[model samples]
Target: EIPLKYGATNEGKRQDPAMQKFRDNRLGAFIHWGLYAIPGGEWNGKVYGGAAEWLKSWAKVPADEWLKLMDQWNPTKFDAKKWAKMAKEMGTKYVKITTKHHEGFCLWPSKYTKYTVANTPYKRDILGELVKAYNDEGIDVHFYFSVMDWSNPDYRYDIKSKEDSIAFSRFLEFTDNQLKELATRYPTVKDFWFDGTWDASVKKNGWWTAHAEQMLKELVPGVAINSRLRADDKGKRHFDSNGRLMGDYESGYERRLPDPVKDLKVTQWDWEACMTIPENQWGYHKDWSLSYVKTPIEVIDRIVHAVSMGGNMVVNFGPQADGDFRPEEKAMATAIGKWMNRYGKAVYACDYAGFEKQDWGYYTRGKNDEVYMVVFNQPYSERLIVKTPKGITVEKATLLTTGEDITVVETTRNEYNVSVPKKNPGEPYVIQLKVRA
Candidate 1:
């Protein structure tokens, strides 16, 4: 299990204007770029379905064996501006880049370690370039740093003796140095999403983990830190002994969707769900044959699902070694962009409506006291059912696409039937209801 801390009123709390901006932005894009992109998921020319990012650790291809792959790290076709443009078109408000991963490869030139982009042939700053590009396009940039460093000799899973503490302390210093470098070097960074801390190395030295959050806050006020970086005996991090969550928001809803039946109100906090295009692959792997890739409809539906559950969905992108996206990825981006261009009000800064799922589709509410009915499952019948709280009148109902009128009939105080058009518009559609309480 993982322990956690909670609440904005926690000891290191500061007035963060950016937190509101981040929360309002809602949607984000994740770019998993590091030394893992070099191999693109193959060893000795034999492609494996596993993630290329974990090739160093999962394949157990030791530093000597894996370090050799760094020679091929040149991304011939990578253009930061182009990537930024795609993200902007996708309507993603922010982009999170993996500065370091489990393999201990750093995109930034970390002075503490030799395993960094500086050591590779492409000694340029990948994070720096992307940050500038993303910022130029008016998107916030967040850094994803891994706490587990397989390349570092000081890392330990358990500390049984005094020697363990000594070894762990050096590791802490190294982590601190790298973090300080990132926080200082990229002064305009919005947040840090820490990963790979589920290991005992981070759990034992959890104080430093908490301290890291504090230090980063001092360096960059309003900079958000994810909850994955901290934990106690019960696997609780960021949340204190009492059960109050300490971090800004909940993290780690990767690949899997949260259960709608479960009561999420237990967590009185904000959260983000990171989703992958392919099953279980965060890094670029050459052979995509292993995983069932998601279609654009599935991606769009999942985004709707996240909003319906009162959370943000962050789509993951693993760029190829040449710095270009795969065909499937481009298609997904373009398709989603087209959809958002039409019915984005259903997602942008919307909250889950207080109702159960019906055969018609999902429901999301806006701040204007209006309800948006996203019709994922187009009903064969000419009418869609909606149940809201008592004493509310739906003054108008309009199709989000063509602004066509869809007559609404109030059945009871809290129930109503929305008439669907005889010639139903194909694909998922949204019906906006202007309401008055």
Candidate 2:
């Protein structure tokens, strides 16, 4: 059982106003744009093939060698408005831009480092422009910053000493300065989704982890931090020193998400899942042909899965160096938007439903005790069996797409078979069931 700092109800939820804002802004878009887009995961004389974003660490390139790619950092057709408009059309309520990844190249100008957008030929604050454009589209902007600095010479993976501590302290200060720059420079940022903190250097110097949170909150009120920014003495990931759930939400759901029904208690904690169009690539890799690209149905299915578990889903997009999305990414965004445009009220502001998982699909809850059965598979016999906990009753049933009446046949206590409509909807169809208290 998870112990509570506060209770688990509305009063038990993290009372910080910033956390509340994060919870309210459920759906988001994660943009993994950076110098990695230029390399597309190639390194040295050969392309040491893996995810482009992790090329720096995976290939073990030196700081200067890795950062030299910034010389070619010009996003020739980068248009923030177009990107933001795409996000709005995709129905994401917010966006998390990578302010800095493990490569330590800042999207905004950082006083601590010369490897920033300011020093590059591009010479434009990418993060700043994104904030402006996304905000204009009424989308909340969150920044993704990495704590493991690949560019810092002092970053030690295994060795430890007093001198190392002192050097790493300076690295921590560098992180503090960058965070300050982002918070002060842009007052509109809603949260920070931290990544890349897996080294022993950060684990040994965990004091600064807590300090970073205190300092960031002091600098900008209502700015949310992720679980990666803090660590325990034993070097565990995504929890505080006291084993308490830190940060506004649990955000490790990248490329994968927790099972909604299997891990139902995750609903008790605020959380979000980040996914990709292709299976594993977060940054633009030139060859999606080699990867297992997900279809629009798969993508939309995951979004509904997260919402049904009382969590949000942030689908990631890896824009090409030319500042345009690949065809697959564009197709996914349009497909998800089409579905959400019609049936989003059943998805966006919903909670987990208590109904047992149906054979056809999943369940999501509406505000007034209304339940939505998102059916991916219509039964062969034109009717499907569903079971609620012994108490509740289904008072009404209708298909979400056409608002056509559906037949509900109650067979046993809390057991019912919902008959299919005259015509089947092409995509996933929703059956709204209103329960009487």
Candidate 3:
């Protein structure tokens, strides 16, 4: 291993109470709300199909002019309780809220900066309200903070001169203050998901990133930090110069997931995968027709896929300018919530089964001695194949939804054929297995 001061602090998966709870809460939601939602991906009467959150940059709007949106930032329809209720019904254990994005408009009021919700027409602490409401609903809240500030001139993309160093130094201090404010104000924040730290300036100041991680851990006991928030002493991100993962869990799986078969290495450590319902919009876009929108089944499939691979999945929701969800977004959540209501046993408190992948669907193992088969595609053969580890054997199988006894026929040594449901449910279903060694 390379000798470095900012390398990984822990070698394998962290087993602390906080880290255990982080992994146990497998499914969460991403809430992308900011000044960009007002424009909704259109600029100058022309709509760009790019990500709505990046609209300010795509339209080349100046910082001063863009910051003006905060004046109009009145989410009158915003009810913290309503948002929390929606997530609770959606079966999401947690919600990742954007306290601040690349545009540098703060949801929480920071004394050091005038660009925050306190200065907006709303005149309320959105972040504080959300934290309280979510905690009230028994849901955990994670803050999504972007380190790059497009609104501040001090924020440097790269340090090419002594002037750049001096300016960025103040920027880092401002960032540090903001972070400390958050940790102090919201004592219940469980995790911090960082974004916009890919610039050369941040990579050069890897020491600061390391310090930020250390400070947060000390301030808020057991608070998990993303790998994106750090750079090594040698400019490596996520993993260090010697290839050990930094921070608590890996957060690089944005809008993409590791291959369940080809990328099993990810199962060795903790990680999370976040995805958008549309092809690629993290913030609210006016015209979702511009891209192919994924159905609830497709989204649910991704959710199962992530949990099956020993990881967590967070589906993104871009709330509109009016601070209410779009009809499509609401419907998607309802569909998922209903499905989870029936088949949630296969998901909650489950982890990778450590078995081979099957053609029909995924296998998720509960901490108990039970394994589950979530069938997405019912085979024509009417018999689901099961191949267990050398010493494990299937004792019984039952349909999770109907509680009907499922026939299990052993075909060979350590192999069995679990029959499909007697009646076709015509939707994704779960079958519980009692396995013994």
Candidate 4:
């Protein structure tokens, strides 16, 4: 093992109360809001189909002109209570709000930076309002902070010389101050999801990344940090050279997930996966016709697939400049709420069932030793296949939607065929099983 100053804080997984809550809160919603939402991917009469959040880089806009977008930062329709209610009805246990993105615009008033909500047309503590509103609705809040700041003169992509090193050092200090301000302003934040730390400047100062983790943990006693915030002695990002995860939980599953069968190794660690509704947009895009949008059914499958693998799933939403969600986003939230209201037990406080992946669906294990099979495909034989581990056997199966008994017959050792529900729910459904060893 390399004797490094900043390596994995915990060897395997975290089991503390704070980490347990972070894990149990399986479903989350990502709020990506910033000045970029104003343009919504259109700039200079041309709409770039890139990530709306990264539109500043795509359009090649100068920092002076891009920072001017702050002048129109007014979400007139933004209602904190309404946002919280939407998240509550969507069945999300947590919400991760973007405090700042790579564009260097701060959602809250930071004394360290002039490019903040306080300097915008609408001068209010939007971040504080969100923290209170979501907490009142019994939903936890996580902050998404980007370490890169395009608006800052000292911000450097890489440190090549003495001047480069000095400027980047100041930028890192500025970032620390902003983080400190956020932690002190809103003590209720449950997690810190860092982004924009993939640059050479950050990788070069690996020790600062380690210090940021330690500093935030001290500021917020139980706050969980993501894997994206760390760099080891060898400048290895996320996992160290030894392949040990450096943070409380893995956050590298952005916009994708580990394969259920072939990527079983990921199931052994605590990780979170996030998804964008469109092909790539994470900010409010004025037009979605340019890309394909994921349907609500497709999204539900992702949530279940995440829980089935002992991971958390966060659905991304980009609100319009006027502070209202797109119709597609609202419908997505409603559909997820309806389905979760029926089969939430199969997800909440659930973990990987330790069963081999099945063709019909995925399996999840609950706190009470009950197993859930989320089935999406029913064959012509009207039988759902089940294969139990060596010492275990399926006792009975009950449909979660209506609590109806499902007949189960043992075909061979450790294998059984469960009867599908008589009435098709017209959507994916869950079947809870009572197992015995």
Candidate 5:
């Protein structure tokens, strides 16, 4: 086994009240706003069908050329309170906003860099406003910071010479300063979701990652860090040299989900999965016609799938450059909010239940042992299969939306055929189960 000088500081999942609150925030919203939202996915006359945030790379735009977008950075319709209210309506317990993306553009006015919102037409502190607004709406705020800075000269993809090491060291210090600024400025922030840490430069300097985590925790006690920020001395990412999770939770599930049946082991650890509504766009793209957009029911299914696996799910929303959300996004948010309003009991403060995977849907359990069957597929048999663990039995079943009683027929010692309601609700629905030992 390879030994590492810098390994995981915390050995396992945090049991503190802070971490418990984070775990209980089963539903979250992600906002990816930046200069990339200006041109969006289009470079020149053609549109690139990739992640909109990677427009710089796709368009081959020089740093100086890309920074010119600051001149037109006025988000005339940007309203922090409005954004927070939307998130609340969407039933999200937390919101993760991009403080800085790979483009090295700062949403806040950072003293460390000249390229920031301070120099732009939108001179207000966007991050500060968001932090306050979201917290006011009883939503936890998490900062999303990207380590790969294409706009910073000190950044190196890979360290090869003494010059590379020195410059990269300076970049690390710059990153530390920005992080300190964030922690000091927004003390109410709950977590950090780091990205673009996959480069060889970061893998070689694993100690810096460890240092950043310690620094943030010291500055803001109980502040969570994502696993994406860590790497072992051996260049192993996420998990350390010993195969243990490095940060507060696993973050490998991005834009994809863990297997519901085969990847049940993820339930052993605290994790969060983020998804994009458009096929690949994280930032606002002028044309969503390039890829298929996810429907509200489809998005809800993904959210339930993650919660059913004992993980938090955050849906992504990329607002337009003018700070107004796309029509599709607004409609999607409203749809999700309506569903959440009706059956949010299946989501908030819920975790995976110890039940066998059924074809009908996923299983989630409340803190007080109340089980929820979030049904996505209506079975032709008119019965949802329920398999309980040994020594556990279902006392009663009821519809979560209307509290109507559902018949439970015990077919086996540990199995039951839960009958669906006579009138089928067209969309995805939830069934509440009262279980006893």
Candidate 6:
């Protein structure tokens, strides 16, 4: 094992009340909104079918050219209250908003940069408005900050020379200031979800990463930092040199999930997975025809899959430049909200139930010993097979929404065949199980 000067300061996953709340809030909404939404993955009248947020890179637009998007950035229809309401209806306990993306356009009026919402036509503190509105609706706000700023002259991809080192050091200090400003301004903000840290410059300056985490925690007591933001002295990111998770939770799962059966190792600690509704667009794209758009059921299954693995799942929503969600996104949110209204008990405050993987669906356990089977696959067998570990006995099985009893028949030692509901739910549904040792 490699020794490290800077690793995790906390001995284990934070056991404080704040961390507890974070863990309990299993569902989150990831909103990616910025200047990129204006162009929305098109350049020179040609549409690029890549991640919409990366359109600047795909278009190879000069930084000066890209900053021009701000001139047209008036999102007249963007209502913070409306967004908060939609998220609440979606059953999300938290909303992760992009304060700044790789394009370096600050959503808040940051004194550290001229390229910000303060200078744009929209000229409003977007982040501030969102934080307040979401908090007002009982939803926790998390900031998504990209460390790699393409708009900043001081930004460096790597520090191969003395000039590079000096400039990058200044950039790090600028980053610290922006973070401090955010923490001081939005005191209720709960978490920091960092991105654009996969650079040689950041990896080499692991001390700054450690310092950033400490600084944020000091500024906002009990604030959760994502795992992607940290690096040990040995340049190890996410996990420390000794292989322990560095931040409050693991954030390695982005646009993907751990193996439900083989990757149970992730269940040992707190983590969160983020996903995009379209094939890969985190920002708005003019056309979703370029890729596959996930149906509400597909999104629901992913959310259930993540919760079943003792992790939080954040579904992404990219609104248009006009401050209103695209029709697809709005529809997706409404569809998800409808389902959550019925089966959210199987999501919120639920974690991994140590059950063997089955073909029928995923399993999640509430903090209070209530087990949930989120049925994604309606087996032709007409029975949901549940295999409990030794000493755990099935007491009662019922529909989660209606509380209609399901007949449980003991099939073999530590196994039972629970009958499905006589009337088909016609959609993905959750089954609640009362179990005892």
Tens digits of per-residue lDDT for model 2, 380-399: 98878879886788888988
Each candidate's TM vs. the true structure?
0.93, 0.93, 0.99, 0.99, 0.99, 0.99
Write candidate 5's Cα lDDT for 262-315 as tens digits: 999898889999999988899999989988999999999999999999999999
| Clash count for each candidate, listed in order shown | 25, 1, 0, 0, 0, 0
Candidate 5 error regions (>4 Å):
none
* C-alpha lDDT of all candidate models, in order: 0.80, 0.80, 0.93, 0.91, 0.93, 0.92
Candidate 6 local Cα displacement, residue 171, angstroms: 0.4
Candidate 2: deviation at residue 207, Å?
2.4
Model 6 scores what on Cα lDDT? Answer: 0.92
- State the local distance difference test value for candidate 1: 0.80
- Give the distance in Å from residue 246's predicted Cα in candidate 2 to where it truly belongs: 1.9
Q: TM-score of predicted model 2?
A: 0.93
Clashing pairs in model 4, backbone N/Cα/C closer than 3 A: none
Candidate 1 TM-score over all chains jointly: 0.93
Question: Could you tell which candidate, 1 or 3, scores higher by lDDT?
Answer: 3
Q: Which stretches of candidate 4 lie over 4 Å from their true place?
A: none
- Superposing all C-alpha atoms, what RMSD in Å does each candidate have to the true structure? 2.8, 2.8, 0.8, 0.8, 0.9, 0.9
lDDT of 1 at 333: 86
After TM-score superposition, the amount by which residue 101's alpha carbon in candidate 5 deviates from its true location, in angstroms, is 0.3
lDDT of 6 by residue, 150-264 (tens): 9999999999899998999899999999999999999998999999998999999889988999899999989999999998898889998888888889999988999988999
Show model 1 residue runs off by greater than 4 Å: 1-16, 233-235, 238-241
lDDT of 1 by residue, 276-298 (tens): 88887888887777889888888
Error of 3 at 88 (Å): 0.4
